[PDB]
Amino acid sequence: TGSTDSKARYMVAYVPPGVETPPDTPEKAAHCIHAEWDTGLNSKFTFSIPYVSAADYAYTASDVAETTNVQGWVCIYQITHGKAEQDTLVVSVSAGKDFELRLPIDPRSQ
Amino acid sequence: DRILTTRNGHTTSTTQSSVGVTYGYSTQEDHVSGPNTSGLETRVVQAERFFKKHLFDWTPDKAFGHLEKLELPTDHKGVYGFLVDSFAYMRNGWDVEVSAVGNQFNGGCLLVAMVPEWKEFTPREKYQLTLFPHQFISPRTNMTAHIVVPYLGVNRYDQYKKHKPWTLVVMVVSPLTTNTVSAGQIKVYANIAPTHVHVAGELPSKE
Amino acid sequence: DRILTTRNGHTTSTTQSSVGVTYGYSTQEDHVSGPNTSGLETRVVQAERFFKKHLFDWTPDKAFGHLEKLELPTDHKGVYGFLVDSFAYMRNGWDVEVSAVGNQFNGGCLLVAMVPEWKEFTPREKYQLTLFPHQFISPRTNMTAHIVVPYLGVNRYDQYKKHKPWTLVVMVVSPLTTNTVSAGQIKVYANIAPTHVHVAGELPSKE
Amino acid sequence: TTTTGESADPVTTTVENYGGETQVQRRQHTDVTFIMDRFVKIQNLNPTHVIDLMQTHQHGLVGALLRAATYYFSDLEIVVRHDGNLTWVPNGAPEAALSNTGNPTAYLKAPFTRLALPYTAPHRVLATVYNGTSKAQLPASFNFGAIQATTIHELLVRMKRAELYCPRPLLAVEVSSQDRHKQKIIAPAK
Amino acid sequence: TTTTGESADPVTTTVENYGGETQVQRRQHTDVTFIMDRFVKIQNLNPTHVIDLMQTHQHGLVGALLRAATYYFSDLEIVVRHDGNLTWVPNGAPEAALSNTGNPTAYLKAPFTRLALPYTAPHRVLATVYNGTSKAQLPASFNFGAIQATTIHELLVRMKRAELYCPRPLLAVEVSSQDRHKQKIIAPAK
Amino acid sequence: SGNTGSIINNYYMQQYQNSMDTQLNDWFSKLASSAFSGLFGALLA
Amino acid sequence: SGNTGSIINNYYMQQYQNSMDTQLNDWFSKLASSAFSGLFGALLA
């Protein structure tokens, strides 16, 4: 959502489970599945977080026992920018084409 | 034709005392591209080759039921090992050769088996280890056992740092006997090759 | 169509300010299977993907001729890097993207070139660096340069620990100018992917 | 995928962009008619009770999905545990009618009474929110009739052949943790 | 029959070798789907109970045959004797869900409740032994959901359309006698 | 239709089981199916 | 299938009675059927 005179280059990476902590730099994260893009005429970039797991389905809820996340992390980096100090990147999420939910439950406290 | 040569990558093994190859549970592999990897898995042929490991020394004092095991994968310092540290998920089968070289004047019998989901067996359960894919090694007949198994498990891809689906097991069925002309002990080695190696989910670098 | 997306493996790069792709010296690769590897070479696609490196900070004080270089391959902590330590011989080309993000109110010009068999250039030789595969980056026009080169050298396969055939070079052609509305400096980064990676001669493990 | 974000045109990118492969999906469980078709509790009861789906719990599976729609239509099934005989009257009936046997009256048969009821509102669809007055609360005409018995102990409702229109916000529990909402997921004993 | 024993190739000799004649055999009773298809007791119960087939008795007909396999798949039927209403939630549900009516809830009807349940694990098959950790015991995800009631007195499970893979040891009682294990076989009175 | 699984017809007529619709269309299905996919602009794969 | 003996179809649809299998084989039957029988070598009967 920056002004015309502000530019930036970003990177998004999907980090699977298997490491202690998420990578803090684009360089370490480059070895993961990732996409890089810069700002321009088109203001929006969409990226698919892939389903990569041992089992065919994953739980929607997270258990108290699991310390580090079971499906991994998403890391968003700024490679660099030009005069973009107060300009923002709005992030939203939608379901992908093969996204699927199964086994209805009624979990909320009532 | 007791003579057999096995090739895995740029590595070969030739044995002149073999009783053939035992295939366990299947002759081919289940489908390696399922929904859990979203088409991001790839094959790594550079890892499909033999690596070596000493299992134990078969001596006359070891009695029936003496059991030695090797959970797979084991620590590997080559290409395969690197894959385990660089990718979150993997799957592969195993091409296993076990040799026990003494001479034909030794007597006795070893059971060589591949066991899925290893659990420590009780003394009574050892009488039924032949329920698993196996071959025997008897000095009067062969010096080599050869078993081939596919990948399996509740999950189509696995995290080997957390679960080892296969375990190589060698058990004394009848104790090693010695003569004046026989060997005094037999060192048992494994020559193993991972098969159909697939990986998914590249991890970040540690530096 | 100033918009371009480049894919190398499971990594992509999209730029909205590109002036196209420059191919250097060839559009395809020489034959990767020659007599020197006796058919033992193999391809490793898991290594053909982008890795990143900061080159330098383009500031107003750097004058014409200021030159920054990056010899390739450079230290790599992923799959490609592992290949350099595990195989005696390798060959690959490079897919190179260089970005210099400021804003359109900055002025100046950078020369981005790929040079085979780097030698330190004298001041007079810098006037002819355009003899090498290159593109320019001028804030008024683009933020990205993109060059693609094949593998080359006196030998069909190389030992990268002893020789680096390609060198990425960035040189200031006209100094960065600044306004009240422009960026004050521009950080220059490289997004590089090795291409057509082949290895031969597996080395032993170090343990 | 690069697009013009401001136009708000839907954009569904896929893993194919970086070499993956989109899989097969089975979405029967998120089918609207199916998901709403199960009994849920009503809770605030009196011997005389007007059936209003907005009395379902707002965080309950059915209550929350219902409130995540602006307009809806459905027939209904109810299960009522009551003392005495149970009488039901359609939308629009005078409360006084609940005392008469000429209206659908179910004679007590343990353990409870289950009935199928049709939609009886005078509107083509009902709403979960209504920006105005009829004379915030909903208009009195947004109901499925009323029931009466000596005592009504329990009431369950089930939406049949449900139709939902115009999605509205649906919220999960807020997270204080700073990473993930964690809770005890069922796991084998010992 | 003379063969190479070391190769471990199956060899099934017959009485024909010495002039006998092999007969007709009927093996329906040792068919896997058939033998596992009967109710067995669970025994260790609590008002909140996660359905885990590994809680069958290890020497019971079903429990022993199940443990004589590494991997398995099946749907399930359960019979539960409970006080209060019985609620069931699928594999993966938060324990908290057991308190809500929107989940399959069976209202008490003497003498007990019998239900057919589908397999709900996220794995293609389950295992009776697992050589590793998921964070020896089995992974928490190896279950058929959970049930809850005020009090659960009895629980019977029945494996439907069972599939078993990779045989493991199955033991009879050990014999101390030195010849045969002898026990009282049923015989007419007087 | 939705969460009903009897192989056998209902014992009661439809005019009794449910209310009946009269006449005088899935917007979100169309909206979702109309979504853009892939890439915008040139690709160098 | 296995320990079910009604001559009559189930009142409920299969999609409700059981879970449904998706696709993307009896090893021991083959193993047993492959067993050697008879004698190895010459016979003088």
GROMACS .gro file of C-alpha atoms in nm, chain E residues 31-125:
model
   95
  745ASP     CA    1  -1.074  -6.570   0.728
  746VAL     CA    2  -0.944  -6.241   0.871
  747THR     CA    3  -1.249  -6.022   0.822
  748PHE     CA    4  -1.471  -6.291   0.967
  749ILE     CA    5  -1.269  -6.377   1.275
  750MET     CA    6  -1.222  -6.014   1.384
  751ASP     CA    7  -1.592  -5.939   1.333
  752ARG     CA    8  -1.729  -5.997   1.684
  753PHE     CA    9  -1.759  -5.783   2.001
  754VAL     CA   10  -1.488  -5.795   2.271
  755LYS     CA   11  -1.466  -5.606   2.605
  756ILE     CA   12  -1.249  -5.301   2.669
  757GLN     CA   13  -1.230  -5.312   3.051
  758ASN     CA   14  -1.026  -5.008   3.168
  759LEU     CA   15  -1.290  -4.736   3.159
  760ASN     CA   16  -1.343  -4.376   3.272
  761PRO     CA   17  -1.632  -4.136   3.208
  762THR     CA   18  -1.414  -3.986   2.935
  763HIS     CA   19  -1.266  -4.259   2.721
  764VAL     CA   20  -1.056  -4.255   2.405
  765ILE     CA   21  -1.131  -4.560   2.186
  766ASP     CA   22  -0.804  -4.745   2.135
  767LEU     CA   23  -0.814  -5.107   2.016
  768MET     CA   24  -0.491  -5.170   2.199
  769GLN     CA   25  -0.693  -5.167   2.519
  770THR     CA   26  -0.839  -5.505   2.426
  771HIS     CA   27  -0.695  -5.790   2.637
  772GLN     CA   28  -0.375  -5.920   2.486
  773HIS     CA   29  -0.479  -6.285   2.521
  774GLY     CA   30  -0.836  -6.234   2.410
  775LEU     CA   31  -0.937  -6.376   2.073
  776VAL     CA   32  -0.954  -6.035   1.906
  777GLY     CA   33  -0.685  -5.865   2.110
  778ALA     CA   34  -0.431  -6.140   2.039
  779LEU     CA   35  -0.503  -6.169   1.668
  780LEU     CA   36  -0.482  -5.790   1.638
  781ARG     CA   37  -0.140  -5.784   1.808
  782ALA     CA   38  -0.034  -6.058   1.569
  783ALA     CA   39  -0.042  -5.796   1.292
  784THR     CA   40   0.169  -5.482   1.252
  785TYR     CA   41  -0.074  -5.262   1.059
  786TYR     CA   42  -0.449  -5.272   1.029
  787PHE     CA   43  -0.756  -5.094   0.908
  788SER     CA   44  -1.122  -5.123   1.002
  789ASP     CA   45  -1.447  -4.945   1.069
  790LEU     CA   46  -1.607  -5.000   1.410
  791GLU     CA   47  -1.920  -5.081   1.603
  792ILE     CA   48  -1.944  -5.012   1.974
  793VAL     CA   49  -2.186  -5.109   2.247
  794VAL     CA   50  -2.181  -4.881   2.552
  795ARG     CA   51  -2.365  -4.914   2.883
  796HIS     CA   52  -2.376  -4.567   3.030
  797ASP     CA   53  -2.556  -4.334   3.269
  798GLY     CA   54  -2.646  -4.001   3.115
  799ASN     CA   55  -2.615  -3.917   2.750
  800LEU     CA   56  -2.330  -4.050   2.541
  801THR     CA   57  -2.127  -3.825   2.319
  802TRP     CA   58  -1.869  -3.928   2.063
  803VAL     CA   59  -1.613  -3.713   1.879
  804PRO     CA   60  -1.382  -3.813   1.594
  805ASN     CA   61  -1.006  -3.861   1.598
  806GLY     CA   62  -0.841  -3.521   1.640
  807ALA     CA   63  -1.116  -3.344   1.831
  808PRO     CA   64  -1.035  -3.129   2.137
  809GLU     CA   65  -1.135  -3.315   2.453
  810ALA     CA   66  -1.354  -3.015   2.534
  811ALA     CA   67  -1.587  -3.102   2.249
  812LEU     CA   68  -1.721  -3.403   2.441
  813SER     CA   69  -1.946  -3.170   2.635
  814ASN     CA   70  -2.147  -3.051   2.339
  815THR     CA   71  -2.462  -3.184   2.184
  816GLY     CA   72  -2.368  -3.087   1.828
  817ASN     CA   73  -2.140  -3.391   1.822
  818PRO     CA   74  -2.307  -3.733   1.781
  819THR     CA   75  -2.493  -3.765   2.107
  820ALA     CA   76  -2.703  -4.067   2.194
  821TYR     CA   77  -2.981  -4.014   2.446
  822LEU     CA   78  -3.006  -4.290   2.705
  823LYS     CA   79  -3.229  -4.584   2.602
  824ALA     CA   80  -3.203  -4.898   2.813
  825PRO     CA   81  -3.020  -5.127   2.824
  826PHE     CA   82  -2.732  -4.971   2.631
  827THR     CA   83  -2.632  -4.795   2.313
  828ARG     CA   84  -2.500  -4.969   1.999
  829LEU     CA   85  -2.347  -4.748   1.723
  830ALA     CA   86  -2.164  -4.794   1.394
  831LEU     CA   87  -1.861  -4.561   1.361
  832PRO     CA   88  -1.631  -4.496   1.071
  833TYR     CA   89  -1.253  -4.501   1.081
  834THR     CA   90  -1.141  -4.139   1.140
  835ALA     CA   91  -0.761  -4.151   1.176
  836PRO     CA   92  -0.548  -3.924   0.953
  837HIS     CA   93  -0.323  -4.217   0.862
  838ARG     CA   94  -0.393  -4.464   0.578
  839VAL     CA   95  -0.358  -4.752   0.829
   0.00000   0.00000   0.00000
